[PDB]
Subunit: 89 residues, 2 copies
Amino acid sequence: ECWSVLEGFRVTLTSVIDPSRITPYLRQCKVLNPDDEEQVLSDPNLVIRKRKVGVLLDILQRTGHKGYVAFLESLELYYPQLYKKVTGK
Amino acid sequence: DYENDDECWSVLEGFRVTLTSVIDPSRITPYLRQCKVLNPDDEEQVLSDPNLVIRKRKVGVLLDILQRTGHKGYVAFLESLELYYPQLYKKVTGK
Ligand SMILES: [Zn+2]
């Protein structure tokens, strides 16, 4: 019954909260599993996702060769076909 | 060294549109943070949602997940507002 209470504030909550600000806390409370945090944080809108990856790349570039290597590592783990594409295998 | 500290990144520039189309950044920012090339601020910047319509959807999805955990999710959610959204915490608690 505690959640049915908050329903009246749903639009205010969904309007103010940036979820990535509180999912790390909620995950540590063990009320969000990794499949949960994925659905919340993923970007199915291509326009939005492109922007965010662009910002990520911009941040990594400022770290120089270190960020480049770490970025390639992440692709080999998580986006293997992309990794081969951009590294020419 | 056709990927030295100065030039490695310019090398990827030709693949930028494809990288930005395929990668879901939340799948790799945890890794990159563990590689120590992303600091917590950086990751908040990448993952944040400046578009209201998008942000609303995500919070709604988050609320539905949390509700499925019952009173434990309610208590955790409220604690997270108290810490990170104190004015919203006041609002929903009547204060
Ligand atoms: Zn309850």
